[PDB]
Amino acid sequence: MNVGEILRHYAAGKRNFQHINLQEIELTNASLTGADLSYANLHHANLSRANLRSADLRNANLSHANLSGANLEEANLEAANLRGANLVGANLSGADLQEANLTQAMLGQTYPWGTVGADLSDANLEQADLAGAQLVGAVLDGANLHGANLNNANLDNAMLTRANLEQADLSGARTTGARLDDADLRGATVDPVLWRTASLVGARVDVDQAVAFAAAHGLCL
Amino acid sequence: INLQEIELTNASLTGADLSYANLHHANLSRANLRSADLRNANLSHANLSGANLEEANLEAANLRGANLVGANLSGADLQEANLTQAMLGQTYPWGTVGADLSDANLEQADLAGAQLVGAVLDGANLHGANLNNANLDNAMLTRANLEQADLSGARTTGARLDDADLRGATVDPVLWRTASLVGARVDVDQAVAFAAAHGLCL
Numbered sequence: 518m519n520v521g522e523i524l525r526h527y528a529a530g531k532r533n534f535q536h537i538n539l540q541e542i543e544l545t546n547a548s549l550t551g552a553d554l555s556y557a558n559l560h561h562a563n564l565s566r567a568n569l570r571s572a573d574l575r576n577a578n579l580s581h582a583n584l585s586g587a588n589l590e591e592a593n594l595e596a597a598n599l600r601g602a603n604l605v606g607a608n609l610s611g612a613d614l615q616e617a618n619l620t621q622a623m624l625g626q627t628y629p630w631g632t633v634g635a636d637l638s639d640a641n642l643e644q645a646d647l648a649g650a651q652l653v654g655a656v657l658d659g660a661n662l663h664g665a666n667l668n669n670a671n672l673d674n675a676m677l678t679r680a681n682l683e684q685a686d687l688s689g690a691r692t693t694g695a696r697l698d699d700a701d702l703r704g705a706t707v708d709p710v711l712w713r714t715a716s717l718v719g720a721r722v723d724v725d726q727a728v729a730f731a732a733a734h735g736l737c738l
Numbered sequence: 739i740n741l742q743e744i745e746l747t748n749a750s751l752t753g754a755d756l757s758y759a760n761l762h763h764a765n766l767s768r769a770n771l772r773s774a775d776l777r778n779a780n781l782s783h784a785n786l787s788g789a790n791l792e793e794a795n796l797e798a799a800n801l802r803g804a805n806l807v808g809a810n811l812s813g814a815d816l817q818e819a820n821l822t823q824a825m826l827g828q829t830y831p832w833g834t835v836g837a838d839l840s841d842a843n844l845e846q847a848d849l850a851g852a853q854l855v856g857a858v859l860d861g862a863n864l865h866g867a868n869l870n871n872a873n874l875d876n877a878m879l880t881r882a883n884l885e886q887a888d889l890s891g892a893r894t895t896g897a898r899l900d901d902a903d904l905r906g907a908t909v910d911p912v913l914w915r916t917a918s919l920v921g922a923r924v925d926v927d928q929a930v931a932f933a934a935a936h937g938l939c940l
Contacts, residue, residue, distance in 0.1 A: 731929035
């Protein structure tokens with residue numbers, strides 16, 4: 518299936534594209550809201566600025582894809598493979614991404630003139646794998662990363678305020694200038710550097726973690 | 739013996755056994771009292787500014803309101819002394835001048851309301867000492883034993899407590915945000931308060 522047809526079928530009103538092969542398709546600025554594209558194959562597909570609001574996308578292959586600036590509001594993406602995808606500036610506000618793969622992925626990018634972060638406000642990221650992902654300046658305000666894997670995640674200038682990070686793995690995570698005000702870090706595994714860098718005014722922490730915060734400032738015990 | 743109000747400026751009185759004396763308001767400015775037995779002596783409101791007092795046994799002495807600004811007390815036995823309202827330090831327009839209290843034994847001593855601005859208590863023993871509402875602005879309190887001490891209401895802006903030992907002491911949250919504490923030894927309950935002092939919820 519190619520471009521001139523998948524648009525023709527969307528122009529007719531088809532919403533059932535599940536398991537349909539769509540590798541490397543050119544869909545820049547294409548509007549495809551609501552469409553069931555679950556289990557489909559979008560390996561390396563170009564979806565820059567593609568309006569994909571509330572599209573079913575569970576288990577879909579999206580690795581090494583271009584989704585920068587793409588509207589992904591309320592899209593269901595649980596277990597979808599997004600390894601190495603480009604989401605710099607994309608809006609995934611409130612998307613379901615539980616048990617989804619986001620390793621090596623590009624969510625943020627610092628340019629000389631400023632930082633552009635993808636909007637993940639109140640999004641769901643339970644058991645998600647963002648290991649080695651770059652979330653520079655990414656807006657995760659109010660998101661949920663319960664038990665999520667953030668091993669070696671780049672969180673410079675990220676707004677993780679009001680975030681649920683319980684049972685998360687923030688080891689090797691770069692957290693300079695990261696806002697974690699009123700976050701839930703209970704049970705998470707963070708390096709000592711996080712206690713000295715991320716703003717934690719209001720962060721819910723464990724008794725074990727509070728001491729680690731103190732020991733991270735050179736207090737002997 | 740009584741020797742109250744006497745004027746011994748720049749006087750050399752080293753090693754003198756002046757125990758149980760009555761030096762109420764005695765001007766002992768710059769008076770060399772090195773290694774002087776002064777235990778249980780009444781020195782309240784006396785002028786001891788600039789006076790050398792190295793290793794002077796001053797235990798149980800009453801120094802309430804005395805002026806020890808710039809005085810040398812390097813290693814004086816002041817355990818269980820009374821030093822309330824004392825002038826141990828002063829911030830002048832050109833700078834702060836504080837008394838040397840290096841390695842001084844202040845065990846169970848009472849410094850309630852004493853002004854220790856810029857005072858050097860490097861490595862001093864202050865076990866169980868009372869520092870209620872004590873002015874510790876820019877005081878050097880490094881390696882100082884502060885076990886079981888009470889620092890409630892104390893002003894600690896710019897105080898250095900690096901390598902100190904605060905285990906057991908009762909301090910206000912403001913201390914955790916104002917004093918340097920690199921290498922300090924604290925409790926589990928204290929280390930949690932240090933985190934609560936910076937805004938973490940439990």
